[PDB]
């Protein structure tokens, strides 16, 4: 297992524009296009991302290209963020994937708001962090995924994905 295989499970693969759990236009492997309610706006973002008229549809290779860009971006977001970098520093090779997974889903700014759970993670209070993350609105909204991500934080194993 690794962050790519983990997120592939949590996001799935869709070659046409759809709406995510927040009702936002999305494509590929969890690639958020826009928060605008306009499908035309989403399509404009897609065409810019790929560099062709996609008509709301992409290939698997195009999805993987975006996916690689998006995991990279999530990592850069963690590394640049004063709240997230210290947490990253305390996370081993498995637990760090749960943090990347959160940033992938919610973004740098969204995840940086989990002040108390983040402090718990930074201090290696795995069980405290897991309890506190459970709870969250995040968990209430997407409990299936959140449970899996929380177990990864708690245990430092891939048990929730296997």
From Swiss-Prot:
Keywords: Antimicrobial, Bacteriolytic enzyme, Cytolysis, Glycosidase, Host cell lysis by virus, Host cytoplasm, Hydrolase, Viral release from host cell. Changing residue 20 to E/Q: Loss of 99% of enzymatic activity. Changing residue 20 to A/N/S/T: Complete loss of enzymatic activity. One of its GO terms (biological process) is cell wall macromolecule catabolic process. Its main location: host cell. Optimum pH is 7.3. Its EC number is 3.2.1.17. InterPro entries: Endolysin_T4_type (IPR034690), Glyco_hydro_24 (IPR002196), Lysozyme-like_dom_sf (IPR023346), Lysozyme_dom_sf (IPR023347), Phage_lysozyme-like (IPR052619), T4-type_lysozyme (IPR001165). It comes from the Viruses. The active site is at residues 11, 20. It holds the Pfam family Phage_lysozyme. PANTHER family: T4-TYPE LYSOZYME 1-RELATED. Endolysin with lysozyme activity that degrades host peptidoglycans and participates with the holin and spanin proteins in the sequential events which lead to the programmed host cell lysis releasing the mature viral particles. Once the holin has permeabilized the host cell membrane, the endolysin can reach the periplasm and break down the peptidoglycan layer. This is Endolysin. It comes from Enterobacteria phage T4 (Bacteriophage T4). The gene is E.
